């Protein structure tokens, strides 16, 4: 995943990095057992 590779591998930092790299987003929080990278 995009940093979110599960409960024991929840790198929301990298999820944020990912989403920040996407235009129209400013960040990205890691959700759903640390599996879903959700950009905002």
Residue at 2 is within a domain:
no
Residue recorded with tokens 């995009």: 2
Residue recorded with tokens 């024991």: 8
- Helix (H/G/I), strand (E/B), else coil: 12: helix
Find the angle CA(26)-CA(6)-CA(4) to the nearest 5 degrees. Answer: 20
Among 11, 38, 12, CA closest to 25: 38
Q: Do the beta carbons of residue 5 and residue 18 sit within 8 Å?
A: no
Residue recorded with tokens 């879903």: 36
Residue recorded with tokens 């400013």: 26
Burial class (CB in 10 A: 0-12, 13-18, 19+), 36: middle
Binding-site members are 2-4, 12, 18, 29, 31, 33, 37-38
Cα radius of gyration (the chain): 9
Structural domain range at position 23: 7-39
- Structure-solving method: NMR
Q: How far apart are CA 4 and CA 2, in angstroms?
A: 5
CATH code at 13?
3.30.30.10
């Amino acid at each position: 995943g995009f940093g979110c590779n599960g409960x024991w591998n929840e790198d929301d930092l990298r999820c944020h990095a990912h989403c920040k790299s996407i235009p129209x987003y400013k960040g990205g929080y890691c959700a759903k057992x640390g599996f879903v990278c959700k950009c905002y």
